[PDB]
Amino acid sequence: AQPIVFYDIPSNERIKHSPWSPNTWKIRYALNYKGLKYKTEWVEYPDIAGVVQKLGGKPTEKTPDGRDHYTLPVIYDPNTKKVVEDSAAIAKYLDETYPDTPKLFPAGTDAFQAAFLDFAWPVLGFPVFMLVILDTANSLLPRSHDYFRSTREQKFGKKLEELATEEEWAKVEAGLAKLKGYLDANGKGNDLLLMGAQGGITYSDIQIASFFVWAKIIWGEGSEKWKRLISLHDGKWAQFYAQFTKFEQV
Amino acid sequence: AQPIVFYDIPSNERIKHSPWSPNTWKIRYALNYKGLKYKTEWVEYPDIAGVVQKLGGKPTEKTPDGRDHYTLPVIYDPNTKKVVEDSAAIAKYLDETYPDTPKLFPAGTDAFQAAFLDFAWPVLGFPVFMLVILDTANSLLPRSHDYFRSTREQKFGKKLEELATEEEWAKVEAGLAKLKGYLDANGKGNDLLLMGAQGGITYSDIQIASFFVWAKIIWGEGSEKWKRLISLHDGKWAQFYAQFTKFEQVD
Numbered sequence: 185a186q187p188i189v190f191y192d193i194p195s196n197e198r199i200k201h202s203p204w205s206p207n208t209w210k211i212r213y214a215l216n217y218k219g220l221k222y223k224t225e226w227v228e229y230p231d232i233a234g235v236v237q238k239l240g241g242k243p244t245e246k247t248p249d250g251r252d253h254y255t256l257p258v259i260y261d262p263n264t265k266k267v268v269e270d271s272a273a274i275a276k277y278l279d280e281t282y283p284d285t286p287k288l289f290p291a292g293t294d295a296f297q298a299a300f301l302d303f304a305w306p307v308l309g310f311p312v313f314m315l316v317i318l319d320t321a322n323s324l325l326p327r328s329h330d331y332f333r334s335t336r337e338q339k340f341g342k343k344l345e346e347l348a349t350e351e352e353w354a355k356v357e358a359g360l361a362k363l364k365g366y367l368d369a370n371g372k373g374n375d376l377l378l379m380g381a382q383g384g385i386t387y388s389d390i391q392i393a394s395f396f397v398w399a400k401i402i403w404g405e406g407s408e409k410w411k412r413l414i415s416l417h418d419g420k421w422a423q424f425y426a427q428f429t430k431f432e433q434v
Numbered sequence: 435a436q437p438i439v440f441y442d443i444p445s446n447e448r449i450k451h452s453p454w455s456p457n458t459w460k461i462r463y464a465l466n467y468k469g470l471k472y473k474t475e476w477v478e479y480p481d482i483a484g485v486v487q488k489l490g491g492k493p494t495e496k497t498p499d500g501r502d503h504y505t506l507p508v509i510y511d512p513n514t515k516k517v518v519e520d521s522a523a524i525a526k527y528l529d530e531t532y533p534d535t536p537k538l539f540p541a542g543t544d545a546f547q548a549a550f551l552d553f554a555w556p557v558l559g560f561p562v563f564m565l566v567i568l569d570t571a572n573s574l575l576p577r578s579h580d581y582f583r584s585t586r587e588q589k590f591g592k593k594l595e596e597l598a599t600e601e602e603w604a605k606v607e608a609g610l611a612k613l614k615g616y617l618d619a620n621g622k623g624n625d626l627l628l629m630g631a632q633g634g635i636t637y638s639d640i641q642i643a644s645f646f647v648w649a650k651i652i653w654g655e656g657s658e659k660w661k662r663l664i665s666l667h668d669g670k671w672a673q674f675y676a677q678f679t680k681f682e683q684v685d
């Protein structure tokens with residue numbers, strides 16, 4: 185079979201040109217975990233809309249003014265001749281199109297995952313975003329930097345330099361405390377995956393891991409910031425995240 | 435099998451002494467759904483702390499003052515001689531202790547349900563509360579009314595009479611729109627239970643149903659407010675809720 189074409193956002197030498205996006209990483213994870221062959225095409229932030237339109241793909245939401253908003257990840261599957269957008273929809277497509285691969289949406293879990301996904305950004309991803317947003321912008325190629333900084337600063341009404349605070353660190357920890365609580369409901373020995381030790385990795389687990397790999401890559405694995413995040417709750421997150429390192433092929 | 439003892443909050447003639455609490459209804463639903471025998475013991479709000487302590491039960495949370503906070507539902511199972519508190523825990527206990535009964539927490543769902551349940555009040559339960567809180571209070575016995583009005587008005591900083599607004603109605607509709615979105619992920623034919631048509635009722639489904647039975651009992655099934663609520667999203671919620679009426683036995 186031909187490699188799926190995977191559209192991702194590039195980076196500069198600060199992070200050695202590593203992919204970095206929490207949103208595209210969900211799909212890089214899905215592909216690596218499923219053992220599917222793919223090739224990465226690199227698209228700068230301001231070129232996303234153009235590229236996706238030229239592919240025949242669709243926007244995934246609308247900006248506050250009401251304009252179509254195009255996002256990555258997007259894939260083109262040469263085996264089905266289909267373009268697929270929106271990370272959750274892409275993961276589901278992968279399950280359905282490649283049924284011999286491990287399922288990210290086991291039967292009976294779709295609505296539960298939809299709900300979990302809907303709260304992952306407010307409770308965890310957004311506070312993390314604030315802690316990594318400046319270093320993210322500085323890891324972008326020049327044209328991406330200008331688009332990202334201008335649009336994100338416009339959005340939050342602050343310079344990117346003002347967003348990371350200790351209050352955001354408290355929000356991250358509080359969000360991870362909630363998550364630890366949910367995982368605790370599975371019982372001892374089953375509290376490192378949402379569906380338990382023998383449940384396997386779901387799309388929802390990947391969503392949490394994608395927040396971690398984002399922070400790790402942007403901050404640096406040898407950094408103190410990374411060490412601070414990963415050390416919370418007595419090293420629980422180091423254990424959780426360590427489950428995903430085998431699936432970080434680039 | 436001896437009946438489980440089920441501790442619930444009583445009400446006055448306005449709703450013909452019917453059980454009404456969305457919290458105790460989660461366990462009423464669980465017991466009914468599982469077909470377990472039980473009997474209700476009625477406890478007024480200000481008496482809950484003393485009654486649970488006497489049972490040898492435990493508080494379920496901490497008040498901001500760092501004091502113990504006792505809540506219903508609580509059960510006493512004479513078959514195991516166990517007192518169990520906190521509705522989610524009671525439901526889990528019922529799964530484990532009575533394995534022949536239909537599961538409320540299917541294998542692999544515990545954490546997903548914990549997350550869902552944590553979302554349920556802020557997304558949907560709380561705006562429903564604002565629209566039923568006055569009528570709820572006016573359905574309580576006098577000692578319960580006094581305690582409930584005192585504590586809840588202190589909590590929300592307004593008179594109970596001031597809590598229902600159209601903004602709350604909009605928040606209710608928005609909350610249901612989110613839930614409808616989650617259910618749509620299951621696909622047509624599977625979008626009326628969280629785990630789909632063949633997955634069966636979960637504790638999480640019962641949590642949503644408990645908001646509906648609460649409003650129905652408090653408002654009255656013939657009320658225009660009830661008709662307005664279940665007519666949202668082209669009557670989807672009328673269909674969702676109708677699944678549960680077969681489990682609304684009241685001893």
Ligand SMILES: N[C@@H](CCC(=O)N[C@@H](CS)C(=O)NCC(=O)O)C(=O)O
Nearest residue numbers: 205207244254255256257270271272
């Ligand atoms: N709902 C989308 C969101 C993806 C998303 O926001 N991706 C970012 C990259 S991290 C993006 O392409 N933003 C487009 C822009 O800023 O114009 C998904 O999950 O795929």
Ligand SMILES: N[C@@H](CCC(=O)N[C@@H](CS)C(=O)NCC(=O)O)C(=O)O
Nearest residue numbers: 455457494504505506507520521522
């Ligand atoms: N977390 C508890 C909360 C139950 C709860 O808040 N029940 C209310 C009755 S609707 C209560 O006993 N509140 C006692 C009080 O306000 O003092 C549970 O889910 O069982």
